[PDB]
Design a protein around this ligand. Structure first.
Ligand SMILES: OC[C@H]1O[C@H](OC[C@H]2O[C@H](OC[C@H]3O[C@@H](O)[C@@H](O)[C@@H](O[C@H]4O[C@H](CO)[C@@H](O)[C@H](O)[C@@H]4O[C@H]4O[C@H](CO)[C@@H](O)[C@H](O)[C@@H]4O)[C@@H]3O)[C@@H](O)[C@@H](O[C@H]3O[C@H](CO)[C@@H](O)[C@H](O)[C@@H]3O)[C@@H]2O)[C@@H](O)[C@@H](O)[C@@H]1O
Ligand SMILES: OC[C@H]1O[C@H](O)[C@@H](O)[C@@H](O)[C@@H]1O
Ligand SMILES: [Ca+2]
Ligand SMILES: [Ca+2]
Ligand SMILES: [Ca+2]
Ligand SMILES: [Ca+2]
Ligand SMILES: [Ca+2]
Ligand SMILES: [Ca+2]
Ligand SMILES: [Ca+2]
Ligand SMILES: [Ca+2]
Ligand SMILES: [Ca+2]
Lengths: 149, 149, 149
């Protein structure tokens, strides 16, 4: 009875949809996501900002963006080394924007930073220290994505 | 068509259920689960007891309960920091019971503990050296969950 | 109804297929898988070679096989202790092969290794500095599986 089978399959679907959902809530917890909080992740791979921005999307995530002191200390914890942030000023030199829109609300630059130094530095990378410094986007640092609370 | 399509989706639900199962195995493996033995998991987020309880449930698991030494240690290694256990005497002061039910059948308290200190301590937290100590349920300690072997 | 419910369902299914392949991509990512590079996993369990060969197969993976300095160091940083490698000379003493077939094309033995010490040593473990040492396939060591790039 086609009528039946369908309903049965709509059941096998929901159960799976519910399982995979559970599988993911346990995968985040595993990855250290705090309760109802945006949490970061990294494979420790170094690459240009175009590839990181890329990779974070394929994983349905955004390039890491510290919107306060905590999230910054937290991003430092994850990468060890230097890693790009979801911040650039490619649109308007000197005017840093989150890859997700909006102007920086929380910052943490180093003395004389940013500075577009040399041929021009449009990407921001937090360095093993917690402070940030602007650098060439064609450079290559630790890829780090974030995921919604 | 209609009948065939309904068939093509049959094997789909199967191959799925089949992949998700394998995927869940790979995870457990990756999160420490040892062969045939239950396994503990944590985000390290310190919190009150009641939360750890709701949290482990949302994940369809339970607050970590050492049922002997190997387990007590296993929880000790994964937590790396003060953590609650599925054990409390909030029912009958003086008698600790598992959240899953029953009376304590294994312990590893430290000198003079439990002491139902101050106004009262009805919650258990594995502490340094893997020893135990009752502390207020309100206090905040690492949430840890266990999933079946 | 029926026909519409079917097209709607087929969509639901393709959605799950994607959501899962995502779950999978995000996991390998957090497990340090570098882009286009085979990643190595572990539960840290120590066991005999035969037991590892099997554990890796149940996950459809294989015993980690370092073929260059990179992969070695990767694995070495995954084990954190000694672990078997998908390499042995069980068939012809002094002619180490890959469990996946063929003679070795790269090694990183310790000094004066391999030595087939005692009753014999036909297996291999990555030890310190990721250096190699042929051991007894019956000795228990960290199980580490590898999955496709
Ligand atoms: O400690 C070991 C050894 O390290 C250094 O020499 C080796 C080093 O050489 C080449 O790059 C030098 C590079 O090293 C970095 O460790 C760091 O010192 C860099 O310094 C800049 O960046 C930091 C980050 O905040 C700043 O604090 C510092 O002031 C410098 O920034 C200045 O310039 C920026 C733009 O370039 C600008 O944004 C800043 O505002 C500021 O003006 C230092 O430049 C490489 O061979 C390097 O290898 C790695 O990097 C290569 C590309 O850079 C790449 O091709 C390689 O594959 C590899 O990834 C290597 O480490 C030096 O410190 C030496 O004294 C020391 O003994
Ligand atoms: O006997 C254990 C160990 O002892 C020495 O380190 C060497 O003989 C090794 O080849 C051997 O595996
Ligand atoms: Ca510019
Ligand atoms: Ca700039
Ligand atoms: Ca600069
Ligand atoms: Ca009480
Ligand atoms: Ca008490
Ligand atoms: Ca106490
Ligand atoms: Ca032999
Ligand atoms: Ca040998
Ligand atoms: Ca040896």
């Amino acid at each position: 009875a086609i009528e039946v089978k369908l309903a049965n399959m709509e059941a096998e679907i929901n159960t799976l949809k519910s399982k995979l959902e559970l599988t993911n809530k346990l995968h985040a917890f595993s990855m250290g996501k705090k309760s109802g909080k945006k949490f970061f992740v990294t494979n420790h791979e170094r690459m240009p900002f175009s590839k990181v921005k890329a990779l974070c999307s394929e994983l349905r995530g955004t390039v890491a963006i510290p919107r306060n002191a905590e999230e910054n200390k937290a991003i430092q914890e994850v990468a060890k080394t230097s890693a790009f942030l979801g911040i650039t000023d490619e649109v308007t030199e000197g005017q840093f924007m989150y890859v997700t829109g909006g102007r920086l609300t929380y910052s943490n630059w180093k003395k004389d930073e940013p500075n577009d130094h040399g041929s021009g530095e449009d990407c921001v990378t937090i360095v093993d220290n917690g402070l940030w410094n602007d650098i060439s986007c064609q450079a290559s640092h630790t890829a780090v994505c974030e995921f919604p609370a």
